[PDB]
Each structure stands twice: as structure tokens, then as C-alpha cells.
């Protein structure tokens, strides 16, 4: 081979946009769940 | 006093349950098996924040349900170790009136409704402050003084 090795790290091709989309969706769901948890925790902590 | 709806829940009597409104209510720190051998089989939801635990009252004993209310005007209220006074935002009893094992005693207004449930309290000399759960409009609350302990 004339070139070097493919790459030692994370040189996956474009159309890794699929990876970006799935990770972003999962992150959005986790962020929404965490926001709901913290808002209900704030509401319950205000209550006394 | 003039109406019995309480039940104990352990062979060694420590804590008692009440039939208030539409819930059977028992404080959390006490442990045991509620008598009559059907209520203890009910599904109980608990909350360590409020030291409370509840369950839906079976239709069999809806007639035995005790009336309840949310207003707590300043005055005197009565429980099974005598009388209490809701003075200055606190429930207070004379020192020595309460002792371990007395959680779950309701506190009544003069009309026979329930306005409180005792968990314990602390003493300052001749008097004793109470740790009690109560419900305002639509939401229960818990009030505790300094240096109290479970009863």
C-alpha cells in the first residue's frame, strides 16, 4: 500500500451522521428525563 | 374517644393505624402487621420524607371512616393521652404525657374530625413540642421541632 494505515482513531466516514443522529436523539431523551427529574425535585424540595 | 377506628399493627404495641377519609394511614418508622388480617394485605405506598404510608380503604369499612378536615384554628385539641393545644404554629403537650410507642394517635377537633397524626416530639421543661403530619388544602405536610425523636 502506498498510503499509510486507515487511521489509528475515529476516522469513520461521513454518513456517520447516522451515529450523530442516534446519539443526539438518545441525548435529547436523557436530557428531557433529567430536566423533568430536577424540576420535580425542586418542586418537592420547595414543599415542606 | 367517642369513635373507634384505630387498629394496632404489632404484637408488641408500637404505633397504630387510622381510617381517615379514604386512606388507612400509618407512620413509616413503626413496623408491624396491621391487624384484622386484611388491611395488612393491602398495597401500601410510603414516603420517607413525610414518614407516612397509605392505602385505599376497602369498601367493607367505608362506614368506619373517620371524618377529617384541614383547618387548624388556634385552640385546644384532644387525643388519647388527654388534650393538646395548637399554640403558636406548634402542637404542644405537657411533659410526660407522650412516650415511645404513641405514634399514630390522631388529633381531633371539637367536632370529631381528624386534623393531625402524631409521630413524636421533644420537650422544653414543663412543656413538650410535637412532631406531626397534617394536610392543608390538597397536600399533606410534616412539622417537626428541634431535637425530637420517634415515638
Amino acid at each position: 500500500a502506498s498510503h499509510t494505515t486507515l487511521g489509528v482513531q475515529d476516522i469513520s466516514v461521513t454518513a456517520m451522521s447516522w451515529v450523530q443522529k442516534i446519539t443526539g436523539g438518545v441525548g435529547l431523551v436523557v436530557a428531557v428525563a433529567a430536566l423533568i427529574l430536577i424540576v420535580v425535585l425542586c418542586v418537592s424540595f420547595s414543599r415542606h | 374517644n367517642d369513635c373507634i377506628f384505630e387498629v394496632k399493627h404489632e404484637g408488641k404495641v408500637t404505633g397504630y393505624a387510622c381510617l381517615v377519609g379514604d386512606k388507612v394511614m400509618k407512620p413509616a418508622h413503626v413496623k408491624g402487621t396491621i391487624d384484622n388480617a386484611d388491611l395488612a394485605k393491602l398495597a401500601f405506598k410510603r414516603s420517607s420524607k413525610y414518614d407516612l404510608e397509605c392505602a385505599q380503604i376497602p369498601v367493607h369499612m367505608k362506614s368506619d371512616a373517620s371524618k377529617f378536615t384541614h383547618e387548624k384554628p388556634e385552640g385546644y385539641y384532644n387525643w388519647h393521652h388527654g388534650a393538646v393545644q395548637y399554640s403558636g404554629g406548634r402542637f404542644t403537650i405537657p411533659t410526660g404525657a407522650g412516650k415511645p410507642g404513641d405514634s399514630g394517635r390522631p388529633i381531633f377537633d371539637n367536632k370529631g374530625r381528624v386534623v393531625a397524626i402524631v409521630l413524636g416530639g421533644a420537650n422544653e421543661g414543663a412543656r413538650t413540642a410535637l412532631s406531626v403530619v397534617t394536610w392543608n388544602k390538597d397536600i399533606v405536610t410534616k412539622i417537626t421541632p428541634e431535637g425530637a425523636e420517634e415515638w
Binding site: 451515529v19 442516534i22 446519539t23 438518545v26 431523551v29 436523557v30 428531557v32 428525563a33 433529567a34 423533568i36 427529574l37 420535580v40 425535585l41 418542586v43 418537592s44 414543599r47 | 381517615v20 377519609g21 379514604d22 386512606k23 394511614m25 405506598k45 414516603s47 413525610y50 407516612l52 397509605c54 385505599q56 377529617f68 394536610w135 388544602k137 390538597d138 397536600i139 399533606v140
Partner: protein, 52 residues
């Protein structure tokens, strides 16, 4: 395998946090006699009253 495993575990943690939030935002209404849960909160937290 690693990516699929963690992502499903992430959504499991999210659904668990949602369940915990529902529990801690609904138990005050469950303990209180009278059962005055509003229609909006019943729909949001997916609970039903005792008269419906």
C-alpha cells in the same frame, strides 16, 4: 455491541428517572385524603381518579 448496549442502557436510565419523577411528584397526592388531583396533572403523569 458496546454502542448498542450503552444506548439501550441510557434509555433505560432515562425511563427509570422518569418513573422516579412520577413517583415523587405523585405520592403527595396519593397520601392526602380527598383525592383532588387535577385533570391536567392526571393526564401528564398518567393516573386516573377514583370516580372515573
Amino acid at each position: 455491541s458496546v454502542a448498542s448496549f450503552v444506548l439501550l442502557s441510557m434509555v433505560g436510565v432515562a425511563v427509570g428517572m422518569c418513573m422516579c419523577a412520577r413517583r415523587r411528584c405523585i405520592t403527595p397526592y396519593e397520601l392526602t385524603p380527598g383525592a383532588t388531583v387535577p385533570f391536567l396533572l392526571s393526564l401528564i403523569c398518567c393516573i386516573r381518579t377514583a370516580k372515573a
